[PDB]
Amino acid sequence: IIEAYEQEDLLHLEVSDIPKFQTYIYQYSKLLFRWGLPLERVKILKVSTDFRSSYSSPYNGVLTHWIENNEFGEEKFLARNCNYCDLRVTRSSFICGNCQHVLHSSCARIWWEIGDECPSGCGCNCPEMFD
Amino acid sequence: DVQSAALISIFGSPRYFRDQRVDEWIQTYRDMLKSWELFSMRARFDVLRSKLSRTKTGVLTADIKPRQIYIQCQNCKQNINTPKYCCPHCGSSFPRCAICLMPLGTSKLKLNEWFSFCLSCNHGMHAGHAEEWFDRHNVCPTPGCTCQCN
Amino acid sequence: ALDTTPVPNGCGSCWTATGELFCFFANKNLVISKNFSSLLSDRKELALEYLFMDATPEGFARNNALVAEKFDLDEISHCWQILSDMLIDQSDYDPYTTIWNNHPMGIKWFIKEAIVYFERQQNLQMLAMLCCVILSARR
Amino acid sequence: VEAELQEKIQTLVDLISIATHNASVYLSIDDLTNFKIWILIRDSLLWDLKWMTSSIADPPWDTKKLIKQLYNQATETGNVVLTVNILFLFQTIYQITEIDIAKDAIAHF
Amino acid sequence: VVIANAHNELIHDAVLDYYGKRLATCSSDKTIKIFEVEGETHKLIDTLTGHEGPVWRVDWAHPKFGTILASCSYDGKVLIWKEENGRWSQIAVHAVHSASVNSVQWAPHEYGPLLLVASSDGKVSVVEFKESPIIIDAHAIGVNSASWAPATIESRKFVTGGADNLVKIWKYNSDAQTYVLESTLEGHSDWVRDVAWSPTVLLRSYLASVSQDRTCIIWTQDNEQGPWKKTLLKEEKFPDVLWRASWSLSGNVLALSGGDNKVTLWKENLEGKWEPAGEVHQ
Ligand SMILES: [Zn+2]
Ligand SMILES: [Zn+2]
Ligand SMILES: [Zn+2]
Ligand SMILES: [Zn+2]
Ligand SMILES: [Zn+2]
Ligand SMILES: [Zn+2]
Ligand SMILES: [Zn+2]
C-alpha cells in the first residue's frame, strides 16, 4: 500500500516487460510514412522515445543567436520583442534573413494575409527575401 | 485629436524637416493603437511611414528598429543566409521538418515556405506543418525535447 | 563475347502500401493492378481512426474496440475490449488497483501473450498499437 | 443435440447475469480491483456466447484461458472469495483445475 | 489501372514511387516513361530519353532526399535523374564498371542517399550521391541482383545475387571500411535471377531468391547471427522461367514473375508451408 502510494505511474513497466517495442514502433512509423499520415508517425515515435528516455541527430544543427548590442534602457527590452504585437518572443518564432526581425507564429500567420512588407517598416519584402 | 495630426504630419516630416512634435504625435498614436489592440493598423501605419519617408533619391530617412537575431549552424558558427538544402560554408545538412522530412532551403507569404524556429528548443518545422501539429498537441515533435511551443 | 548477360525479363510486379499489386505484362504491353487488400494484415483504414493518446487510457482501447468492430474485425476487437476492461481507473485512489495492475500475472501477461500471438499472424500494426497503448497509459 | 446447445446458451446467459450482479456489488462497495475481474469475466462469457451463437497456441483473450489466469492470480494473491466464487460458477462447463483441488478449496472456504 | 501499349517494345521494369502515386516504366526502347497513377488515371508526364541501351532496373529515391529516380542500363553507366519544376533532368553519371550493369536499388533513408550498383563484371560498387565509391568483387562469373536489408532501428547489411550458383550475405565492417562477406548460401543449380529481402522483420528474418532453373528458396534466419534455414517454396518445379520476386510491404506475401506472363501469390501458413494465394495473368 505504501509503495502504491509512492508512485504516480499506472504500471511499473521495464525493458524486459516489453522486449521489442522499438523495432515494431519504428517499422510501423515507416509504414505510416508510406501512407498519407505523417502526424501519427511523429506521435508513435514520441511515445517510443518518451519511454526510451524514461528508462535511460538529424533534427539539430541549427541554433538561433541574438544580436549582441550594448543598450541601457527601453531598447534593450525591445530588442528581443515581436515586431507586430510588441511582446516578448520566447517560443515559436519566425526569422527573416534580409532584415533580422522576429515575429510570432500567430503574428506572422495573421500579418502575411494582409501584409506585403516588414511590420517594423524597414523596407524589406519579407515574403520574397527571408532566404 | 492626435490621430489626424500624426496621419497628416507623416507625409512631410521625416522627408523634409526634423521636429519633435511630429515624433510625439507619432509615438502617441502608436501607443494608442497598441492600447486599442489594433496591431494590424499599427503595422499599416509603420509601413505607410516607411513608404512616405523615402526622399526624391529614395533613401529611407525614418528611424527603424535595429536588427535582432540571426541563424547559426553550430559547425562553422556563421550565418546560414547572406543579407540549396545545405550550409553554404561548411556544407552541413540543415535539419528537416519533423512532419514531412524536408530540409531548410537557403540561398503574400505562404504557410509552407518559412520555418518556425522556436527559440527555446531550437527545433524547426514548416509553418503549415507546425500549425497542424500544434493544433491538436502541445509538445515539440523532435525526440528528446519538452517544450510547449504553441 | 565474355559478358554474362541474362535473358531480359518480360514481366514483373510492384507492391504498394494499399495492397494493390502493380503488374506489367507482354503479349503491345499491358500494365494492370489488382486489389489484394484481403491478403494484407495491416490496413490503412484502421490507422486513420485509431486514437491512442488523446483520451483516457481506457478511452484508447474502447475507441480501438469500436473501430475494429466497425470494420468486421473480431479477435482484434475483443483484444481491445479486454484491454479496455483491464485499464479502468477512477477519480478516487485505491492502492489495490495499482497492486493488481502491477502484478506479473495481470495486464503484463496479456501484453506478452498478445505480442506472441500476433507475431505469428505477422500483424505489425497491432504489435505497435499495443506497444504504444501500453506505453502511453504508463504515464 | 440442439437441446444441449440451447441449455448451454441459457447457461451462458444467466452466468453473464450473475457476473453482472457480482460486478455491481463490488462497484457498490467501491472496490475497482475486483470489479474489473467480473467485467473481464462477463466480457469473456459474451465472447463465448457469440461464438456459440455464430456456430499453435490459444489467444490470451480466450474465455477459458483468461478465466483460468484470473483464478490463478486470485489464488496467488489470496482473495478467497473470488477464487472460490469462480470455482463454483465455472467448473463444469470450463475445466479449471483438478476436482480434488476444487473440492478442497470449497471445503476450506 | 489498365495501361495498354505503353512502350513499342518489351517492357522490363515498372516501379512505383514511395507514395504509390507515380509509376516509372523502363524498357528496351531506351525510354523511361513516368505516369501519374493517382486514382485510376495514368496520364503521362515525361518521355525521358537519356540511355544508349536497354534499361534494366529503376528505383525511386526517398522523398526525404527529394524527387530522385535511379536508372541503370546496358552501357555500364548509371544515370541519375532529378525532377525539378516538372522537368525531368539528368544530374550525375556513375560509370566505373566495364561490363553491363543489371541491378540498381536505393538504400532505405536511414542509410543516407546511397545507391547500390551491381554489374555483370562480378563486382559491386556503393556510391553516395550528395550535392569515393567502394568497389567490392562480389562473384566470379556474374552478378544479377543486389538488395538492401531494411533498417529496423534508428549493421548495414546488403545481399548480393550472383551467377556463381550462390546467394551471398554482406555486412559492413568498420575495421576495413568495406562491405565484407558474412555468409554464403547455396540453393540453386543455375544463375540466381533475383534476390529480395523482406521489409518487415518480425521474429525471424526473410529472403527470397528466384532463379531461372524453376526453383525458389525462401531463406529464413531466426537468430541475429544464426544459420539461414533453407526451405522450398513449392515441392514441384515451376512451369516456366522465373524472373523476379517482389515481397509485400506488409506481412510476407510474395509475388512471382514467371516466363509465362503469370504472377503467382504466396502466403505462409502457421506451420510454414507456403500455400499459394492467387494468380495474376495478362
Ligand atoms: Zn507578436
Ligand atoms: Zn524587417
Ligand atoms: Zn525581411
Ligand atoms: Zn556551416
Ligand atoms: Zn515540413
Ligand atoms: Zn523542441
Ligand atoms: Zn520549443
Side-chain angles (χ1 to χ4, degrees), chain A residues 38 42-43 46 58 60-61 63-67 79 81 83 86 90 92-93 98 100-102 109 118 121 131, chain B residues 34 42 47 50 64-65 67-70 72-73 83 95 98-99 107 116-117 119-120 123 131 137 140 142 145:
Chain A
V42 176
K43 299 191 304 181
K46 191 81 176 175
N60 291 352
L63 59 94
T64 77
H65 178 231
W66 289 105
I67 299 290
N81 287 172
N83 280 270
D86 282 331
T90 186
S92 200
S93 84
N98 199 13
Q100 282 144 9
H101 293 146
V102 307
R109 87 164 280 198
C118 196
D131 308 329
Chain B
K34 281 191 296 175
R42 184 209 77 89
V47 304
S50 295
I64 56 170
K65 194 177 287 293
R67 305 167 163 275
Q68 316 182 291
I69 207 174
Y70 82 104
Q72 262 171 351
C73 69
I99 300 310
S107 46
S116 177
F117 274 104
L119 314 176
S120 296
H123 298 129
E131 183 208 356
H137 291 80
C140 166
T142 56
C145 184

Side-chain angles (χ1 to χ4, degrees), chain C residues 107-124:
Chain C
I107 302 185
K108 315 190 184 176
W109 164 86
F110 193 85
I111 296 299
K112 286 185 188 176
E113 288 289 328
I115 280 169
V116 165
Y117 170 72
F118 274 117
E119 269 152 352
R120 286 189 328 200
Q121 288 272 115
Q122 313 283 344
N123 213 273
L124 169 79

Side-chain angles (χ1 to χ4, degrees), chain A residues 96-99 118 124-126 129:
Chain A
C96 166
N98 199 13
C99 63
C118 196
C124 165
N125 290 318
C126 296
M129 276 306 291

Side-chain angles (χ1 to χ4, degrees), chain E residues 32-48:
Chain E
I32 309 145
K33 279 173 179 266
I34 320 290
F35 300 88
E36 291 284 334
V37 288
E38 43 180 359
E40 207 177 1
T41 315
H42 53 97
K43 163 187 173 47
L44 193 143
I45 294 300
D46 277 330
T47 319
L48 166 81

